[PDB]
Design an enzyme around this catalytic site. Sequence first.
Site, short mmCIF file in Angstrom:
data_model
loop_
_atom_site.label_atom_id
_atom_site.label_comp_id
_atom_site.label_asym_id
_atom_site.label_seq_id
_atom_site.Cartn_x
_atom_site.Cartn_y
_atom_site.Cartn_z
N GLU A 131 18.77 17.14 23.85
CA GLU A 131 18.79 15.78 23.30
C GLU A 131 18.09 15.67 21.93
OE1 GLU A 131 20.50 13.20 24.05
OE2 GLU A 131 20.98 13.32 26.17
N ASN B 58 23.79 5.35 16.38
CA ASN B 58 25.10 5.42 16.96
C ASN B 58 26.02 4.45 16.26
OD1 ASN B 58 23.09 5.28 19.84
ND2 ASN B 58 24.08 7.21 19.25
N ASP C 297 27.78 2.04 17.66
CA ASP C 297 27.60 0.64 17.99
C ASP C 297 26.39 0.07 17.26
OD1 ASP C 297 25.66 1.78 19.48
OD2 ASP C 297 26.22 0.89 21.41
N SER D 285 23.35 1.08 17.67
CA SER D 285 22.13 1.27 18.38
C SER D 285 21.58 2.60 17.89
CB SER D 285 22.33 1.21 19.87
OG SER D 285 23.06 2.37 20.17
N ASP E 30 19.00 6.12 19.17
CA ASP E 30 18.38 6.90 20.26
C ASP E 30 17.03 7.41 19.78
OD1 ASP E 30 20.75 6.54 21.70
OD2 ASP E 30 21.49 8.45 21.00
N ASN F 50 18.05 5.05 24.37
CA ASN F 50 18.84 4.16 23.55
C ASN F 50 18.28 2.81 23.37
OD1 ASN F 50 21.61 2.18 23.57
ND2 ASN F 50 21.64 3.87 22.11
#
Length: 129
Positions: free
Chosen positions: A35, A46, A48, A50, A52, A59
């Site tokens: 990750e 991301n 959208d 958002s 991480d 998220n």
Amino acid sequence: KVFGRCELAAAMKRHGLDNYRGYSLGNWVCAAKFESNFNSQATNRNTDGSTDYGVLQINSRWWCNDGRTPGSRNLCNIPCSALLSSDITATVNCAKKIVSDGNGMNAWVAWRNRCKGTDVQAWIRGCRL
């Protein structure tokens, strides 16, 4: 903070993640490797909108507040920046909530794609725990 494999393993163990919800330590460590490459400072935006955050790339859409994800839920009640700290506590507490959520560790796409069904025990091999 860029953790060592065994260093992270040990901290996660101390924080009660081993076998948490049935997921052995190796799973946790395997996910963190893929990750964020064991880097607590890791961030990835991301599509959208958002983002991480941290070693387990939690998220901003559901879990933490970053001030710039409209319609964020903040289920973990913390600012996303808390997830980037060298102390893994907030990351661990939030991860516990996510994993209890229903889809388990499938919540983490690198886990599902790169850890799941593998010999995850390889991830804590050689460590003193």
